[PDB]
């Protein structure tokens, strides 16, 4: 694979270039929020981000080397995690708020408008606070997001070794980034650990988020697009 032949700097350049854009919601401020309309903004937003995600994933070194069935499985497993980390990233500079879109910045009080949602907002806000605490860098962020894509479904499987080789390359990349940043050898491994342990929390929020979306579906709160329905069905809740 040519992905295994990339240098650290080339890796970061590829990932940075593949970044999807920040999208807008169709928030209509002429009418008051209801549970239904807030959740509708979120489900509409998620569907649009998904399309850009699908195309972002294809630009992640090593991903297109996999069979369509493997690509499908990885994205099925990680999609909400990837949406969430992007959200937390976007919200870093807005303490107490979640920047779903530039025209949709919500605080926890607004989150209470949807049943079971505030719990998820709270976890998302705590993670954003953690990013701030660590001063997470953009280059580190894109590495983390790619790790989630390749790792989350990897153990639901020679293609395994290829995935782990790419993952090792990204580890190399993170270290290289920390070193160039002037972190000592000890700080390098300590930060690497701090960053990867965040992924455990991101998985957790995803699992809860999946159950939450499922509940919205089974209560007919909002209609989900066919795509969103299939991504959800894949977690068979």
């Amino acid at each position: 694979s040519l992905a295994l032949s990339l240098t650290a700097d080339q890796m970061v350049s590829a990932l940075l270039d593949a970044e999807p854009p920040i999208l807008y919601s169709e928030y209509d401020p002429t009418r008051p929020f209801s549970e239904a309309s807030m959740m509708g903004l979120l489900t509409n937003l998620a569907d649009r981000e998904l399309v850009h995600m699908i195309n972002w994933a294809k630009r992640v070194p090593g991903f297109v080397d996999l069979t369509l069935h493997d690509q499908v499985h990885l994205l099925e497993c990680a999609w909400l995690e990837i949406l969430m980390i992007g959200l937390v990233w976007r919200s870093m500079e807005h303490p107490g708020k979640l920047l779903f879109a530039p025209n949709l910045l919500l605080d926890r009080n607004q989150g209470k408008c949807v049943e079971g949602m505030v719990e998820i907002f709270d976890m998302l806000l705590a993670t954003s606070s953690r990013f701030r605490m660590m001063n997470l860098q953009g280059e580190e962020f894109v590495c983390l997001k790619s790790i989630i894509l390749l790792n989350s479904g990897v153990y639901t499987f020679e293609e395994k070794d290829h995935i782990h080789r790419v993952l090792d390359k990204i580890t190399d990349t993170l270290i290289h980034l920390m070193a160039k940043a002037g972190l000592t050898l000890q700080q390098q491994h300590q930060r690497l650990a701090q960053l990867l342990l965040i992924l455990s929390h991101i998985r957790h929020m995803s699992n809860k988020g999946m159950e939450h979306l499922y509940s919205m579906k089974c209560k007919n709160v909002v209609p989900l697009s066919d795509l969103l329905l299939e991504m959800l069905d894949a977690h068979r809740l």
């Binding site: 399309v51 294809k58 369509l68 690509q71 499908v72 994205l75 066919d226 795509l227 299939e230 991504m231």
Partner: peptide, 9 residues
């Protein structure tokens, strides 16, 4: 499967 098709476009 929609995703399967979207991954080819």
């Amino acid at each position: 499967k929609i995703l399967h098709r979207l991954l080819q476009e």
